[PDB]
Design a protein around this nucleic acid. Structure first.
Ligand SMILES: Nc1nc2c(ncn2[C@H]2C[C@H](O)[C@@H](COP(=O)(O)OP(=O)(O)OP(=O)(O)O)O2)c(=O)[nH]1
Ligand SMILES: [Zn+2]
Lengths: 381, 431
DNA sequence: TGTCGCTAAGTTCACGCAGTATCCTGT
């Protein structure tokens, strides 16, 4: 993909591929609340990194128009305000307030850098994507069981991670404090680059942590012991040794000198820890420190946060921010995600059904199913 | 014994006004309307907390009394300016003040002091020299205006003593123009002989009431005298309240045939009642449902309206109290009565006599005379009388019992708008 | 589609400035 080719393709996509009808269905939420779509904030990033916010639109036609006119490189969705953002200058000071917004989570592979060995920075590979695969299951289950949020849209971020939009009416009316509470409840791996032991579970395992460890276990052997090989050599297993009390460290080292496979080393570590009881949760702390999602509480706490819009185009990879089907999560491949260049090649190879002829169709289908569920909830209620 | 065998029963000891027949008859309170005189000030109809007097409050009440009377007199006499009593005065000045005695004894012409009000004199006193005053009549507590000089700054020499100005009489409304003449029988305690507690004189008076059927019967205390020999020495086998209740039941039930409106006035000698002046009305007796409209428990003093006729009454022996202190240059009772009417208070004596407890806030609120009454009932230990003082018929019926011997009562006829002859006739009669 | 001008006191609201009071944050 040639990023110099981005300015050539962006218009066509925004003209014949961007799913505006479903997009308006989403952000309009069945028209129940008046001025809901009209008070939504958008922000655009144009060529040469020119940023504009407090953009609002009257209806789908105005949005389609101004978007096709501007051809933005980035589209971010923001809060629904007390008035129309376009007229925020006209609103008396203090009377312009963000009132409702989806509850959103951003999981970014870059935040896992201190604990992955295959890639670094913005590089991803099939060996590390399983971490995202874990996160979506660990988090989404909580959101479906502990909090009872029923309408959850998971979206690929385009490069390094995934976003989650929780759109239940209750989740859209949550205050800042309630959002911060939700984020802290879901958050376990606490600390920066200056801390080595980032998980310190108490004697009692809270049911949520038990279910997160249960989800982790299913994948741990493949991710950590086979793929990541977190015990390949001394430079790496020194870390895991650094994560357990010194008392057994020596006892482990000799054992790790006689083990040929990291699965064997994990068995040995588990046996040694079991023999050594307050430390019976130490293996769980290691698993969490290598597998549990990291959440930027600043992303989810603030109501006025602008997050990458679904079906955006990644300025560098060119991939489309496509929704991820929860059931088919295990089959999701971030490298097969349609790029803008591929879908423009597909478009120029054959009115409201043009996208069905591209590789974008199944993802718009997943989005349509999610919107159908939202409509059913709006009606039934 | 002595009372029961008396021979002068029914004798008319004093008479005034139109001659009437040997027998008096009334309307039995049929076309009679008795109420308390509706003036600006509310009447005393219930107990007020007492026994707590601040000297500052007494000072304020006395000062405002002097100031108010002086303001009325200044408007009436067109006096230009009042001068401080204490300051020296080489030329003649007009001074407002109140009279008093320089010592604790009884006032005499050489012991007179004039105390000014707070507004014009800062409450200062000055001795008075009555050598240059040709005619005067002064009693302690009397608010006066005098023209005089104070050459030494230490002794005021009056040259003129302004006369008193009585309040105007009442102008009755026409509502009672067609009402007939009303008969009033008034009697004052004690009601029992000195050596008995049976109330024989009261029984005789009740018989007289039922016989003559008066329209109003005004009974003034005491009803259970504190000075009764039996009461003081603690020989009574029943509580004071019980004796008083028996007396009131006798009075009210015995007057049922007459249908006469009873007006009961308490006395400072009532051993069972609150010893404070102005005295609140009696409140320990509840008349039956058939006598509620007939019995009026009023306060001491009282201003009553009877078909437009204003009757002032007080149980206090005003004449005895003021006669002991009044000094004159040369009828004494008429002078004292005129003093009472002109001062416009039912008790203008200050300091009071030793036998009366005065709450000065209540005195200020409930002793002003609203108008000059058509009839003024002033029972006294002094001799009975019926006098005409400045157009007001002052009646002293004596006391129903005088020691061991029977006393006297009074009967008078009142009609609004008669001839000013609101009192057609009056008689002091023996019991 | 034209709907005369300016001047002035007055009500209701939106804000400075200062003063008084109560209520907070964490693990
Ligand atoms: N533009 C305009 N000006 C006015 C209006 N009413 C008054 N004025 C101004 C201009 C007039 O010359 C001036 C004089 O006002 P007056 O009420 O005293 O009336 P005028 O003097 O024209 O005549 P008069 O006092 O009745 O003999 O006020 C108006 O309705 N429109
Ligand atoms: Zn990788």
């Amino acid at each position: 993909y040639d990023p110099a080719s981005l300015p050539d393709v962006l218009p066509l996509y925004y003209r014949r591929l961007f799913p505006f009808y479903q997009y308006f269905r989403w952000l309009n939420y069945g028209g129940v609340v008046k001025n809901y779509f009209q008070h939504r904030e958008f922000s655009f990033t144009l060529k040469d990194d020119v940023y504009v916010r407090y953009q609002s639109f009257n209806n789908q036609s105005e949005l389609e128009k101004e978007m096709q006119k501007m051809c933005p490189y980035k589209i971010d969705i923001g809060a629904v305000y007390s008035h129309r953002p376009s007229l925020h200058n006209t609103v008396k000071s203090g009377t312009f307030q963000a009132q409702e917004k989806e509850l959103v989570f951003d999981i970014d592979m870059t935040d896992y850098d201190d604990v992955r060995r295959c890639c670094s920075s913005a590089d991803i590979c099939p060996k590390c994507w399983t971490l995202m695969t874990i996160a979506v299951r660990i988090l989404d289950r909580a959101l479906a069981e502990d909090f009872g949020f029923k309408h959850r849209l998971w979206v690929y971020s385009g490069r390094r991670g995934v976003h989650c939009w929780v759109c239940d009416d209750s989740a859209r009316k949550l205050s800042q404090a309630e959002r911060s509470a939700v984020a802290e409840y879901l958050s376990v791996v606490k600390g920066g680059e200056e801390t080595i032991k980032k998980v310190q579970l108490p004697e009692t395992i809270h049911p949520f942590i038990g279910k997160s460890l249960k989800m982790v276990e299913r994948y741990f052997e493949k991710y950590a012991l086979v793929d990541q090989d977190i015990l390949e050599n001394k430079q790496c297993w020194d870390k895991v040794i650094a994560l357990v009390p010194e008392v057994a460290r020596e006892s482990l080292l000799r054992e790790f000198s006689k083990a040929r496979s990291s699965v064997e080393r994990w068995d040995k570590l588990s046996s040694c820890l079991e023999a050594t009881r307050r430390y019976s949760n130490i293996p769980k702390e290691i698993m969490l420190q290598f597998c549990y999602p990291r959440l930027d509480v600043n992303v989810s706490k603030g109501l006025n946060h602008l997050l990458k819009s679904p079906f955006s185009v990644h300025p560098k990879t060119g991939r489309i921010s496509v929704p991820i089907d929860c059931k088919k999560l295990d089959q999701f491949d971030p490298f097969s995600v349609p790029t803008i260049s591929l879908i423009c090649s597909e478009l120029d190879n054959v009115r409201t059904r043009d996208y069905k002829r591209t590789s974008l169709a199944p993802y718009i289908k997943v989005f349509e199913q999610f919107l159908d569920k939202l409509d059913q909830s709006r009606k039934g209620e | 014994q002595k009372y029961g065998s008396r021979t002068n029963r029914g004798e008319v000891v004093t008479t005034y006004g139109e001659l009437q027949g040997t027998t008096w008859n009334g309307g039995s309170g049929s076309n009679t309307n008795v109420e308390l005189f509706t003036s600006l000030d509310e009447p005393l109809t219930k107990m007020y907390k007492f026994m707590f007097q601040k000297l500052m409050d007494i000072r304020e009440v006395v000062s405002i009394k002097i100031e108010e009377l002086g303001a009325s007199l200044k408007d009436h006499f067109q006096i230009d300016e009042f001068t401080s009593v204490s300051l020296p005065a080489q030329e003649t000045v007009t001074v407002l003040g109140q009279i008093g005695c320089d010592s604790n004894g009884k006032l005499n012409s050489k012991s007179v002091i004039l105390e000014g009000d707070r507004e014009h004199s800062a409450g200062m006193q000055v001795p008075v020299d009555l050598s240059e005053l040709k005619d005067y009549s002064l009693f302690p507590g009397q608010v006066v205006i005098m023209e005089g000089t104070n050459s030494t700054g230490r002794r005021f020499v009056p040259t003129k003593l302004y006369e008193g100005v009585p309040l105007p009489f009442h102008q009755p409304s026409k509502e009672f123009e067609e009402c007939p003449q009303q008969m009033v029988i008034t009697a004052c305690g004690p009601f029992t002989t000195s050596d008995t507690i049976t109330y024989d004189a009261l029984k005789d008076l009740i018989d007289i009431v039922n016989r003559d059927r008066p329209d109003i019967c005004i009974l003034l205390g005491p009803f259970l005298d504190a000075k009764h020999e039996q009461i003081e020495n603690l020989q009574l086998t029943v509580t004071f309240e019980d004796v008083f209740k028996r007396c009131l039941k006798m009075i009210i039930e015995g007057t049922r045939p007459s249908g006469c409106h009873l007006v009961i006035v308490p006395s400072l000698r009532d051993v069972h009642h609150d010893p404070v002046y102005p005295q609140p009305p009696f409140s320990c007796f509840e008349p039956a449902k058939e006598d509620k409209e007939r019995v009026h428990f009023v306060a001491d003093p009282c201003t009553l309206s009877v078909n437009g006729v204003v009757i002032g009454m007080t149980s206090t022996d005003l004449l005895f109290h003021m006669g002991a202190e009044e000094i004159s240059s040369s009828d004494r009772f008429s002078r004292i009565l005129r003093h009472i009417l002109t001062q416009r208070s039912y008790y203008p004596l200050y300091p009071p006599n030793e036998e009366i407890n005065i709450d000065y806030e209540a005195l200020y609120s409930y002793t002003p005379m609203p108008v000059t009454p058509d009839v003024f009932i002033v029972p006294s230990e002094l001799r009975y009388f019926i006098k005409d003082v400045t157009g007001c018929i002052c009646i002293n019926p004596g006391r129903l019992t005088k020691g061991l011997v029977g006393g006297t009562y009074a009967r008078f006829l009142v009609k609004s708008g008669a001839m000013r002859s609101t009192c057609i006739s009056a008689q002091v009669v023996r019991v």
